């Protein structure tokens, strides 16, 4: 290495610096708050009853943690279609607030709930924008909503003069006037009730059974985002140079116990020149200490190529505890300048030939 750095095939007596070294990190650790305040999805996806399609139930979700993993991994959902973003990456990106539109429709009306779709429900009951972002989940509810005598509790609109704007609900029961004959709120030759009730029954086949549908929309208002998945955490280690991500603060070093006393509202301290020195673990609320794991240059002491071919190796300012073929070598010696290997210490006192430091130096005899 000395020959390569010095770019020569011969080396004269002296000490040279070749390269540097540092202790590599072992593993990674992440620590985040204790995780709580889950969004109340249970009261929506397991509600006692669902609203009608023309009167779809709208719910506001804000300021909570939402775990989409359990919903995605659940096998009880017949249809799970996410258009704006991938369902896998839901826990990564998040927005400021969520709207949940829940209702019950027919099995064959499921694909009407999509951007760029047409139909009775798609035009007069629920309209979705083409640029809609979010997800749609649909599942069977035949065992509950369907009635042997016919469940007429669910109604839906069919007759309306104009279509519906996206995310618009109309509940007016005005008698539709298809013909030119005005009606004083009575049906007749050309006046009909816009609302018709479904006839869901257990004996009905696939495509006619009740279907519970929930549509999640994520809105992007300039207010700060507050609603998304939990942040994964892991246990901590000590006395090992590792890289850490304490609550978004990333750094590489060794973590030890510290006796510093914080105040109940700080999170991490520092000393000078914007250098972090102590952190508080969110899950335990303990004050730790950070020390950069050791590093330093290396040097070779040689008595000259023309004399011999054995050299001594010095690591500068490194405690002789983590040195690592020169892991053992010869009797390892510890100096105030670092750790020296390949040379033997003696009790005599001679003149100085190849200065080393801290008041000591070496020479060739070994």
């Amino acid at each position: 290495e000395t020959k390569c750095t010095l770019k020569s095939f011969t080396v004269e007596k002296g000490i040279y610096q070749t390269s540097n070294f540092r202790v590599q990190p072992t593993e990674s650790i992440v620590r985040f708050p204790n995780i709580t305040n889950l969004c109340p999805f249970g009261e929506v996806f397991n509600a006692t009853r669902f609203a009608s399609v023309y009167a779809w139930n709208r719910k506001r979700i804000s300021n909570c943690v939402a775990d989409y993993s359990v919903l995605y991994n659940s096998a009880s959902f017949s249809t799970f279609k996410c258009y704006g973003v991938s369902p896998t990456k839901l826990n990564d990106l998040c927005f400021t607030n969520v709207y949940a539109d829940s209702f019950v429709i027919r099995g064959d009306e499921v694909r009407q709930i999509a951007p760029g779709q047409t139909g009775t429900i798609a035009d007069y009951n629920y309209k979705l924008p083409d640029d809609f972002t979010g997800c749609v989940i649909a599942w069977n509810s035949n065992n509950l909503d369907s009635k042997v005598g016919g469940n007429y509790n669910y109604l839906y609109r069919l007759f309306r003069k104009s279509n519906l704007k996206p995310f618009e609900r109309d509940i007016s029961t005005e008698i539709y006037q298809a013909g030119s004959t005005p009606c004083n709120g009575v049906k007749g030759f050309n006046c009909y009730f816009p609302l018709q009730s479904y006839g869901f029954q257990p004996t009905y086949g696939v495509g006619y059974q009740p279907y519970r549908v929930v549509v999640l929309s994520f809105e992007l208002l300039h207010a700060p985002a507050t609603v998304c998945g939990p942040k994964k955490s892991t246990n901590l280690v000590k006395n090992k140079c590792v890289n850490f991500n304490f609550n978004g603060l990333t750094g590489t070093g060794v973590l030890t116990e510290s006796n510093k006393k914080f105040l109940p509202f700080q999170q991490f301290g520092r000393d000078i020149a914007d250098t972090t020195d102590a952190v508080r673990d969110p899950q335990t609320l303990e004050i730790l200490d950070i020390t950069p794991c050791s590093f330093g240059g290396v040097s070779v002491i040689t008595p000259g190529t023309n004399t011999s071919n054995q050299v001594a190796v010095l690591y500068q300012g490194v405690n002789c505890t983590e040195v690592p073929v020169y892991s053992t070598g010869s009797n390892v010696f510890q100096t105030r300048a670092g750790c020296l290997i390949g040379a033997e210490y003696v009790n005599n006192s001679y003149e100085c030939d190849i200065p080393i430091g801290a008041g000591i130096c070496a020479s060739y005899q070994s």
Partner: protein
């Protein structure tokens, strides 16, 4: 429950010296025995602070509100722009059990107040409210000196507080006491004016001894000294005089 009054509540709004009060921790870091120079919004030293013996007051960048409180008469706060359902509004109340924070569109009365019945149960501050967005309930805030600092930066509402036992008769004491952060709110409002909520005894209303101090903040550079325990012990205003 919305009635006006006859006795026009007018108070002798005098002026007095701000002295060296109104210093708060700007960040959540820890520093031991250091001198740190920081640029931020503060209350300038030896400024002019308004003393009130419930008029509408502009919010500007931030507000420093101090009260030589006796028997915790002062109860609530109202923030907003148009102070009605036209625009978002913020409301803060502090009863004997909890502090309640609401971010909603109320229809405030001309003379809103808490009111107590002489077992206290009376609430007639506004008339109607809907589209209520953010809610919060926490521990109650309150012969003492209560200092509060209200700021609104980047769609974030910061409230800092401090209480101090005082024995001086009339004016603000000549001393130093840093202000610790109290609460942060991630909400977006364009607050420009604010009010004060008074607790009158409804049994005729008798609440006149409501004296407090109001001051405004400006951006400048301060120099702060941190002792060994990380508590601010002294501060210097850089742009005051050549020595500073």
């Amino acid at each position: 429950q919305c009635v006006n009054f006859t006795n026009r509540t007018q108070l002798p709004s005098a002026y007095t010296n701000s002295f060296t009060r109104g210093v708060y921790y700007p960040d959540k870091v820890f520093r031991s025995s250091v001198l740190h120079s920081t640029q931020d919004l503060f209350l300038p030293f030896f400024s002019n602070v308004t003393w009130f013996h419930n008029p509408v007051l502009p919010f500007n960048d931030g507000v420093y509100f101090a009260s030589t409180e006796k028997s915790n008469i002062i109860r609530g706060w109202i923030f907003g722009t148009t102070l009605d359902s036209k625009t978002q509004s913020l409301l803060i109340v502090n009863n004997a059990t909890n502090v309640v924070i609401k971010v909603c569109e109320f229809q405030f009365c001309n003379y809103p107040f808490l009111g107590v019945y002489y077992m206290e149960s009376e609430f007639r501050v506004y008339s109607s409210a809907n589209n209520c967005t953010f809610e919060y309930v926490s521990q109650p805030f309150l012969k003492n000196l209560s200092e509060f600092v209200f700021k609104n930066i980047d769609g974030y509402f910061k409230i800092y507080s401090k209480h101090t036992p005082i024995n001086l008769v009339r004016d603000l004491p000549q001393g130093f006491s840093a202000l610790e952060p109290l609460v942060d709110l991630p909400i977006g409002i364009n607050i420009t004016r604010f009010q004060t909520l008074l607790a009158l005894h409804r049994s005729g209303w008798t609440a006149g001894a409501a004296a407090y101090y109001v001051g405004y903040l400006q951006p400048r550079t301060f120099l702060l000294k941190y002792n060994e325990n990380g508590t601010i012990t002294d501060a210097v205003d850089c742009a005051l005089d050549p020595l500073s």
